[PDB]
Amino acid sequence: HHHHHHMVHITLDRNTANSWLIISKDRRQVRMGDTHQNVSDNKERFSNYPMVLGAQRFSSGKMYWEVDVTQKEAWDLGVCRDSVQRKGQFSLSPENGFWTIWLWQDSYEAGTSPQTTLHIQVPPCQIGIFVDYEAGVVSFYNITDHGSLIYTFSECVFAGPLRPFFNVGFNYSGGNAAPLKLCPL
Length: 185
Ligand SMILES: CC[C@@]1(O)CCN(c2ccc(F)cn2)C1
Fold this sequence. Notes:
Layout (H helix, E strand, L loop, with lengths): L20 E3 L5 E4 L18 E3 L8 E7 L6 E7 L16 E7 L2 E4 L5 E2 L8 E7 L4 E6 L5 E6 L8 E6 L12 E3 L3
Antiparallel strand pairs: 1-2, 2-13, 3-12, 4-9, 4-13, 5-6, 5-12, 6-7, 7-8, 9-10, 10-11
The structure holds (3R)-3-ethyl-1-(5-fluoropyridin-2-yl)pyrrolidin-3-ol.
The site of (3R)-3-ethyl-1-(5-fluoropyridin-2-yl)pyrrolidin-3-ol has 6 residues, from loops.
């Protein structure tokens, strides 16, 4: 791909974070804490899962960013509607306003309903996310493998403003404490 020149500076929105997350001072890194992080509850926070949104809202144009997933066992990445459900249980699907891929139990899958098997020969340490709002496209690129395509959602019904979406995953195993990091342009 040649999408790097629509690069946008993404930062994380503390107010949307699950109350166990720790966001860095620069708002470019997030990890799971070993406890509640001593913040008040609010209607924006994802309650059930270790999720957080980007601060940026997009309703037009082409946007690209990169995320470091080094030494994680589990994570979700992509974009979602600004109006997604925050509280209780839900599935990551375009019907619920999410365009995502994930790693879980040594397999990579796209968040369709039901989920789609991905075929990645080189396990990625960094993921590129490309959104074309007018075209209705969300694409995922393997930066570790010369930018090779991972998955494309097309004919997307965004149905409102979009926000960058992140899930650092649980750490039941003690093997998933590593952060998600937004990579420099
Ligand atoms: C274990 C120390 C941390 O809590 C802080 C930094 N960290 C990692 C782990 C892996 C990796 F690739 C990058 N950062 C997790």
